[PDB]
Amino acid sequence: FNGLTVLPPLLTDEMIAQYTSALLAGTITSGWTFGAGPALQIPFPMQMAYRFNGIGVTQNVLYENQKLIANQFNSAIGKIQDSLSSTPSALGKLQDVVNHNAQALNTLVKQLSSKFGAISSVLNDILSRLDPPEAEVQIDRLITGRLQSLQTYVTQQLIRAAEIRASANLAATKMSECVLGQSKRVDFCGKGYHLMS
Amino acid sequence: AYRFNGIGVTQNVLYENQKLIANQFNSAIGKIQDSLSSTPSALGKLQDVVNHNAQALNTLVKQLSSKFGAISSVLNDILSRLDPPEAEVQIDRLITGRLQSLQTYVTQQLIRAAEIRASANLAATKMSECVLGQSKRVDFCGKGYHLMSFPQSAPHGVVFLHVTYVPAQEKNFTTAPAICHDGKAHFPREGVFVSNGTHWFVTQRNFYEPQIITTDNTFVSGNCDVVIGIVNNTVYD
Amino acid sequence: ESNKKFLPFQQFGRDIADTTDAVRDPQTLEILDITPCSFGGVSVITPGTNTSNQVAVLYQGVNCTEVSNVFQTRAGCLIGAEYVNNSYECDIPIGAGICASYQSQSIIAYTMSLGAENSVAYSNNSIAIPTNFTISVTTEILPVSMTKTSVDCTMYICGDSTECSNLLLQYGSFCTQLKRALTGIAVEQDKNTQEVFAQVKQIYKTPPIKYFGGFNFSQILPDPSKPSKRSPIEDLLFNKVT
Amino acid sequence: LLQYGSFCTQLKRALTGIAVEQDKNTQEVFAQVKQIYKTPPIKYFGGFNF
Ligand SMILES: *[C@@H]1O[C@H](CO)[C@@H](O[C@@H]2O[C@H](CO)[C@@H](O)[C@H](O)[C@H]2NC(C)=O)[C@H](O)[C@H]1NC(C)=O
Ligand SMILES: *[C@@H]1O[C@H](CO)[C@@H](O[C@@H]2O[C@H](CO)[C@@H](O)[C@H](O)[C@H]2NC(C)=O)[C@H](O)[C@H]1NC(C)=O
Ligand SMILES: *[C@@H]1O[C@H](CO)[C@@H](O[C@@H]2O[C@H](CO)[C@@H](O)[C@H](O)[C@H]2NC(C)=O)[C@H](O)[C@H]1NC(C)=O
Ligand SMILES: *[C@@H]1O[C@H](CO)[C@@H](O)[C@H](O)[C@H]1NC(C)=O
Ligand SMILES: *[C@@H]1O[C@H](CO)[C@@H](O)[C@H](O)[C@H]1NC(C)=O
Ligand SMILES: *[C@@H]1O[C@H](CO)[C@@H](O)[C@H](O)[C@H]1NC(C)=O
Ligand SMILES: *[C@@H]1O[C@H](CO)[C@@H](O)[C@H](O)[C@H]1NC(C)=O
Ligand SMILES: *[C@@H]1O[C@H](CO)[C@@H](O)[C@H](O)[C@H]1NC(C)=O
Ligand SMILES: *[C@@H]1O[C@H](CO)[C@@H](O)[C@H](O)[C@H]1NC(C)=O
C-alpha cells in the first residue's frame, strides 16, 4: 500500500459476544421487564404463557401442551444450522461489503500506473531524465489524474456509507422492538404471529 | 387514568396517588432546565449544522485565491501584463479550478441534504406517534412505559419531552401456574397467583395488590391431571 | 534474500498491483526482495489544555522497535502512556479495546469495561413484583432543516471580465444543473419544516385558569409577559444555540 | 501540488467522519443494556434447549 491504511475497530469480537450473551441471559431470565427498568425474575413457562396470551390464545392452551411445544421448538432450533450451511448464498449481504471494499481499493491502487498522456508514469524517471524547467509540464498531468481518482473514490465511499448507516439504524430498531419486547406489527419480526427473538 | 390503563395498571392506582404523581411530575419537569444548562454539549446536533455550513462557505470563498498553476490568481493583472495568446491559455486553468470547486461544493450539499431529509422524516413520525397518541413500540418514545409527550421548538430542529413510567421496590414471591380445587383446575383471568408463605392471592402484573381468590377472577377450563406444578387450595365464592 | 525461482531469462518481478518487488544483481546473479520502508500516521492524545499540558503519541501500524515510555498495542506503538490493570468506562478511544484517561496526575492506558456484573436468581417457583413507581422525563433533539443558498456562476468565476465569460460560455450548461440542484435543495428545506410542524389545521388556546388537578405546566406553556411569546425552555434553547 | 489549494483537508475530514460514524453504528446497535447478566449454572428451563 502507498499511503493507504486500514484502521482497526474500537470493539473487538469478544466484547460484542459478551454483549450478545448478556442480552440473551437477560431476555431468558427476565423477559421484557429488563428493557424498561430493573430486571424481575419469572419462570420461563409462565413467560411463554404470557406471550401466548398476548396474541389471542388463552394460557390453558400452553399449560396443557407444554411437551409438544418444547419438542417443536427444539427441532426448529436444530434445523437452523443445517439450513444456514446448505444454502450457498445465505450470507451474500455480509460478503458484498468486503467484495466492494476490495474492488475499490484495488482500482485505486491500480490507477497509479496510468500515464495520462505523459512521457512516463514514474516520477523518479521523469526527474532523473530531465531539467526542472521541463518537468512541470509532465508533472501537472499526473497530479490532475491522481487528484481526480482520489475525489472519485471519496465520493463513492460517502455514498456507500449513507446506505450502511440506514441499514444500521434499521437493525438497531429491530433489536429494540423484537428482542426487548413483543411486536404487533405485521411481518416486522418474522412471518406469522410474533412470540420472541 | 386512561393513559395508565393503557399500560396495564388499574385506575384506582392513580386516583389514590394523585398528589404523589403530581409532585414527581413537577420535580421531573423542574430538573430539565438545569440538566440542559449544565451539560455543555447537550445540543451538538443543532450546532453541527451551522458549523458545517459556515465552514463550507468559508472554504469556497477561500478557494478563489489559488493559482492552479498560473502566473497569478487575478484576471486583471494577467490580462494587462501578458499578450492575449498567452491570456486565453492562462485563463483556462483558473476557470477549470473554480468550476471544479463549485461542483465539489454542490455535491457535498446534496449529500448533506439527503441525511437532513431522513432526520426530518424521523422527527415527523415521532411527532405524529408519540405526541398525538400513546405508543406501544418499545424504546420509541423514551425509556420505560410511554405516557405522553410535549414538543418544543429549537433553531433548525425540534425538542421532545417524553414522560414515562418506571417500576421500583420489588419483592420476592412464590407462584404456581394453576390452583386445584374439587378436581378442577383454575387459571387467573388477568394477573398472577402469588403467595406470601401461608396464604394465596391473585394480583396484577405491574403492581402488588393482593385479592382474595374468587370465582369472578378465574376460569376453570380443564382438569387437575394435566398441568405440571399445580398447587391445590380452596377457592371461595 | 529471496526464494523465488527465476527462470534463466527473467530480470524483474511484479505482483497483482504491478509494482517492482524483485531484482537480480548484475555482477553476482542473485535474487533479492524489495520491500517499502515503514510509514504511518501520527495521533496525539491530550486532555483539555484547561486541565494539564502533557500529551501522548501513537504511531499507527508500527512496532516500537522502528522508532510508561513504550507500550505495544494492536493499533501501533504508544509512547508516554503507562499501562495499568484496572478497567473503567472509556474516556478517549485509541484502538482495539484500549482507552486512555487522565488520572499524582498522569496519562494511563487500560482495557475498557463493558458494564457492571449482575446476576438474577432464576428459580422455577419464584417471581418478583414491584410495589412502588417513579415518573421520569427525558429529552431528545432532532435536526429538521438547514440553510438555503444560491450561487451565480458568472460573478463567482469571472467577476466583471467580458472575455472570461466569453470563454466560459464555450464549455456548456453546467451552471443550469448547479442552479437546478440548489433550487431543489431549498424547496426540500422548506417542505421539511412544513411537514414536521404543520400537523393540525386549527389553533387551540388554553383556558385562562391554569388548574389541572395539581399539574404545573408553567415551564412549557408560552409566557405572555415577554414579547417573543416563548416558553422559558424555548428561551434557554434559543440562547444556548449561537 | 501545494498551489492547487485545500482539497486534502476536505478528503481527510470526510474520511475521519466516515470512520467515526462506523464506530457509532456498532455502539448504537449493540450497547443497549448497561448490565451484564449471567445465565444460571443449572440449565433447565422447563424442557427447552438453549
Ligand atoms: C412510593 O415512592 C414514593 C417516592 O419515593 C414514596 O414517596 C415518599 O414517601 C416518604 C414516606 O412516606 C416521604 O417521606 C417522601 O416525602 C415521599 N416522596 C415524595 C416525593 O413525596 C412513597 O412512600 C412510596 N410508597 C411506598 C408505599 O413506600
Ligand atoms: C408552577 O410552577 C412554577 C415554577 O416553579 C411556579 O413559579 C414559582 O412560584 C414560586 C412561588 O411564588 C416562586 O418563588 C418562584 O420564583 C416561581 N418560579 C418561577 C420560575 O417563576 C408557579 O408558582 C407554579 N404554579 C402554581 C399555581 O403553584
Ligand atoms: C439439547 O440438544 C443437544 C443436541 O441434540 C443435546 O446434546 C446431545 O446429547 C447427546 C446425548 O447426551 C449427545 O450424543 C450429542 O452429541 C449432544 N449434542 C451435541 C451437539 O453435543 C442435549 O441433550 C439437549 N438438551 C438436553 C437438556 O437434553
Ligand atoms: C429474591 O430472592 C433472591 C434469592 O433469595 C435474592 O437474591 C433477591 O435479592 C430477592 N429479591 C429482592 C428484590 O431482594
Ligand atoms: C400472609 O398474608 C395473610 C393474609 O393477610 C396474613 O394473615 C399472614 O400473616 C401473612 N403471612 C406473612 C408471613 O406475611
Ligand atoms: C393436594 O396436593 C397435595 C400435594 O400436591 C397432594 O398430596 C394431595 O393429594 C392433594 N389433594 C388431593 C385431594 O388430591
Ligand atoms: C516487534 O518487533 C520485533 C522485532 O524483533 C518482532 O520480533 C515482533 O514480532 C514485533 N511485534 C509485533 C507485534 O509484530
Ligand atoms: C494484571 O496483573 C497480573 C499480575 O499477576 C498480570 O499477570 C496480568 O498480566 C495483568 N493484566 C494485564 C497486564 O492485562
Ligand atoms: C426446576 O424444577 C425441577 C423439578 O423437576 C428441579 O429439578 C430444578 O432444580 C428446578 N430448577 C432450578 C433452577 O432449581
Author numbering:
A (entry chain B): 855 to 1051
B (entry chain C): 903 to 1139
C (entry chain C): 554 to 620, 640 to 675, 689 to 827
D (entry chain B): 753 to 802
Sentences from the paper on this structure:
The Omicron XBB variant likely originated through the recombination of two BA.2 descendants, BJ.1 and BM.1.1.1 a progeny of BA.2.7516. The recombination breakpoint is located in the receptor-binding domain of spike, and each region of the recombinant spike confers immune evasion and increases fusogenicity. Recently, the XBB variant emerged as a recombinant lineage between the second-generation BA.2 variants BJ.1 (BA.2.10.1.1) and BM.1.1.1 (BA.2.75.3.1.1.1; a descendant of BA.2.75)16. XBB harbors the substitutions R346T, N460K, and F486S, which were convergently acquired during Omicron evolution (the mutations in the non-S region are summarized in Supplementary Fig. 1). XBB.1 is the variant most profoundly resistant to BA.2/5 breakthrough infection sera to date and is more fusogenic than BA.2.75.
Interestingly, the structure of the RBD one-up state, which has been frequently reported in structures of SARS-CoV-2 S protein including BA.2.75, was hardly observed in the structures of XBB. S-ACE2 complex structures were reconstructed by cryo-EM analysis in both RBD one-up and two-up conformations, with resolutions of 3.18 Å and 2.99 Å, respectively. In both states, S proteins showed the conventional binding mode with ACE2 in the RBD up conformation. S trimer alone did not exhibit any RBD up conformation, it was able to adopt the up conformation at least in the presence of ACE2.
